[PDB]
UniProtKB/Swiss-Prot annotation, chain A:
Source organism phylogeny: Eukaryota, Viridiplantae, Streptophyta, Embryophyta, Tracheophyta
Gene3D superfamilies: Aspartate Aminotransferase, domain 1, dopa decarboxylase, N-terminal domain, Type I PLP-dependent aspartate aminotransferase-like (Major domain)
A GO term from the CC aspect: cytoplasm
SUPFAM superfamilies recorded: PLP-dependent transferases
EC number of this enzyme: 4.1.1.28, 4.1.1.25
Stretches of the chain forming a coiled coil according to its record: none
Official protein name in the record: Tyrosine/DOPA decarboxylase 2
General function of this protein: Marginally higher substrate specificity for L-DOPA over L-tyrosine.
Quaternary assembly: Homodimer.
Single GO term (MF): tyrosine decarboxylase activity
UniProt family annotation: Belongs to the group II decarboxylase family.
Catalyzed reactions per annotation: L-tyrosine + H(+) = tyramine + CO2; L-dopa + H(+) = dopamine + CO2; 5-hydroxy-L-tryptophan + H(+) = serotonin + CO2
Gene Ontology biological process: amino acid metabolic process; carboxylic acid metabolic process
């Protein structure tokens, strides 16, 4: 006897085990060290080298999940986790994938699941109006929205949409002259997107940012660089302002960047990946002011909107530009029911809209706003606690729920960077908290970003006390010779 | 106060609701019409225009799933679903993504979750040895395997690394001379991959296939086209032999194609998205014979390996080529940085999906699972051969039959006959199959693969095909299809 792999009753049986296994996880997630403490190669030695010929009980697999898999996790959901940007999830977002995985439809056209395409077009207008985007970006007006996996894939489709738009006008042999623009703080997804699309690696620009502008891109400096490319015979094509960069959570001013990009007929993709979600709150919406002149806008719902990884939201003014670059239909039908596969790189589309649908319904706009707000006040609190300690300084202004700081010693920039390097890694090696760094403007600053869904105010104070405890211990036995190397 | 959106008790309470909800769905899934019967725009009318300002009870949400979302589903998981290619699911694969959604870790480097990277390299060697792949593709030898979301992006990363392999030898100004090769049966993922990767639209070849070899690509025909392109000033770059094409499950001979591709220093990517999973069985492994002389191999483990959607398995012989092409570190610089093997930076715990499926079912049963699918299709093929008014159009290779109803200029007539006949079967909502036009002949595809599909469902589908064959042919007139 061999029970069918999709037995409804065995599905129910084993399914409840995991739901209780994961509920127990979120309950006791505080007890593991946040950053994993295993050595590289630990798993190849604790597991067999071949697949088993006969079945293994789930009660055995779940046990090995506890002893082999779990010690090899860096607990992104731990309430004492602040590294990088949040992997923000929720119950509503979790059950979104569960229904999407249970149904297991492949929405590569409208017929394969009408609801999997039409619902995505509804909730992208829900989230559009919440962000108060102009009618040019959503389906009520003359635009559209698509759900994908990464911003990097979303930036790519946009880049090739802009690229093909230009090369269709002037010719394909000029791909070696197209230039892609971003600041030196723009995330490395823009560079990778350029590399894949056939953009020349010598034609990728990392415009310099200064501390005077808090490391935001200067429309003056950008246009300076463009004139160099035009004088050199290059074709400027694609510029990517960022609202909430990865290192110093810096913000670029889009309204004068579209000014410059309009002059030289460019594409303005605006990349709020992390910080885009906070713009559903009126007090933060000013950060994407000037997005009405850009060609596309990108935010990542798994970073700061409780929809589980992965879920990336792309809005475009001209969804036909993606159709003409990504559809495999002949080039005389792309200019003539939504076929969302022509808006992205993934043909086998997933029922990703169920995640967003359940998050917006199960919490509503009012509570969804306060969630993001609470993460901002918690970091705002952390920023104020830093300020009342004369041993720390704030390196750059806080914009959205992430604080950058540094423990100054009693050029010394080399010395203050080795101090923070040793101070940070000592706090991180305890396993009690986890937070990363960034070298911005030569300074070595520690990044404290609050966003874990299970993070409460008591955890920020716990991290503050641990930062203070090591501050005492590090500076108490201070000696330049220990850090002057 | 305000309940936390990740409360353990609220997680577990609503978590068991959906588990019962889906087990209920898998029980009654046979009652819905397989192909959706809603009209375009049905859901914008039944739903609000704005997101709610106040939370809605999970109980009320699930009622709108049954009454508004389920009518808009084409039941890929129905036991009577034979359209396109299977969406192979299983309990184990479901628990793999739910375990990987509960942790919800981002695997963009080894430290963000070592097990997310380490486990991915064990299961891909488990699989690799299970398909009897050469040691050149495994981590034990001198290769490597990476799990990606789709084939279109797996074919991409190899395409955008084969290009970088050659363009870094001859200079990047020759991108307009690189030719991408495939048959006219090769899936449109190769065209799209070449489109995104900068290959010129004029330089995509869809080499012709003939019925004389069941529409598999001929290395002789491939070589004729290559010399044609060399004398045109072009540079042959990349060939993609397909094992089990989407239209008629044709097989391109891999070994002679690599022979031609080594003459002209080409990249041979084997596409086995559907068929590859069946080479676990030693009696099927001969289809990817010659993969030892290729550069990359890819199968989708959502079509025929019970891992739900999505799970694509790429085995590259030289993982340096991907890294050197997809990493963003300076070119003088390029543990496992798996993100440098694909287009996705924030990578997910796909390994659990493939881990549970291999572990809880075992090698012995997994073969019998695929063997069962093939055998049911091999039985449906035998039923067609007893009804004298049907014709098997092309040889059945894996678990999919291509048949057509014959009538009692003639091709146009018969092609219209099967179109009307097929859509009358599909419109009942009882069963669901799709078609293809291979060699100008309209044929019906019967793809057995749904995990819930038993033998009585195939026999049930045979009866319905016969009741409509009796029906359309009983009142046959040339004029009804001469239009
Ligand atoms: C500002 C910005 N834009 C784009 C991206 C890349 O998009 P993606 O990798 O999702 O496709 C980033 C990347 N940010 N990634 C982090 C900050 C780490 C990270 C944290 C939480 C997540 O949910 C993800 O996916 C990544 C990194 O350091 O690389 C970005 O910041
Ligand atoms: C032989 C072959 N190679 C590649 C692809 C593209 O892979 P992906 O789209 O997964 O990146 C295909 C596509 N096949 N897709 C179907 C058969 C529809 C389909 C059926 C069942 C599924 O689980 C998926 O994902 C798609 C099509 O007809 O296009 C392919 O056949």
């Amino acid at each position: 006897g061999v029970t069918n792999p999709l037995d409804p009753e065995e599905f129910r049986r084993q399914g409840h085990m995991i739901i209780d296994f994961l509920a127990d996880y979120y309950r006791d997630v505080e007890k593991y060290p946040v950053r994993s403490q295993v050595e590289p190669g630990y798993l190849r030695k604790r597991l067999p080298e071949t697949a088993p010929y006969n079945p293994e009980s789930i009660e055995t697999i779940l046990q090995d999940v506890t002893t082999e898999i779990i010690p090899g996790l860096t607990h992104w959901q731990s309430p004492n986790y602040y590294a990088y940007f949040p992997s923000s999830g929720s119950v509503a977002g979790f059950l979104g994938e569960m229904l999407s995985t249970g149904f297991n439809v492949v929405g590569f056209n409208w017929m394969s699941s009408p609801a999997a395409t039409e619902l995505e077009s509804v909730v992208m207008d829900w989230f559009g109006k919440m962000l108060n985007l102009p009618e040019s970006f959503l389906f009520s007006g003359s635009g559209g929205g698509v759900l994908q996996g990464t911003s990097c894939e979303a930036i790519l489709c946009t880049l090739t949409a802009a690229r093909d738009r230009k090369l269709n006008k002037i010719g394909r042999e000029h791909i070696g002259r197209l230039v892609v623009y971003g600041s030196d703080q723009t995330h490395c997804a823009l560079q990778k997107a350029a590399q894949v699309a056939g953009i020349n690696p010598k034609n990728f620009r990392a415009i310099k940012t200064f501390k005077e502008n808090s490391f935001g891109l200067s429309a003056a400096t950008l246009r300076e660089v463009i004139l160099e490319d035009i004088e050199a015979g290059l074709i400027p094509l694609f510029v990517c302002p960022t609202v909430g960069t990865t290192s110093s959570t810096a913000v670029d001013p889009i309204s004068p960047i579209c000014e410059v990009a309009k002059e030289y007929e460019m594409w303005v993709h605006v990349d709020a990946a992390y910080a885009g979600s906070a713009c559903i709150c009126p007090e933060f919406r000013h950060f994407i002011d000037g997005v009405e002149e850009a060609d596309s806008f990108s935010l990542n719902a798994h970073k700061w909107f409780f929809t589980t990884l992965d879920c990336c939201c792309l809005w475009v003014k001209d969804p036909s530009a993606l159709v003409k670059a990504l559809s495999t239909n002949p080039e005389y039908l792309r200019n003539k029911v939504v076929d969302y596969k022509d808006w992205q790189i993934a043909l086998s589309r997933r029922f990703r809209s169920l995640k967003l649908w359940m998050v917006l319904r199960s919490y509503g706009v009012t509570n969804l706003r306060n969630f993001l707000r609470s993460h901002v006040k918690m970091a705002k609190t952390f920023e104020g606690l830093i300020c009342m300690d004369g041993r720390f300084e704030i390196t750059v202004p806080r914009t959205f729920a992430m604080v950058c700081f540094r423990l100054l010693p009693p050029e010394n920039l080399v010395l203050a960077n080795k101090l923070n390097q040793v101070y940070l890694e000592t706090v991180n090696a305890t396993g009690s908290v986890y937070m990363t760094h960034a070298v911005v403007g030569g300074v070595y600053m520690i990044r404290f970003a609050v966003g874990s869904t299970l993070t409460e105010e008591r955890h920020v104070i716990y991290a503050w006390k641990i930062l203070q405890e090591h501050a005492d211990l590090i500076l108490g036995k201070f000696s330049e010779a220990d850090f002057s190397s």
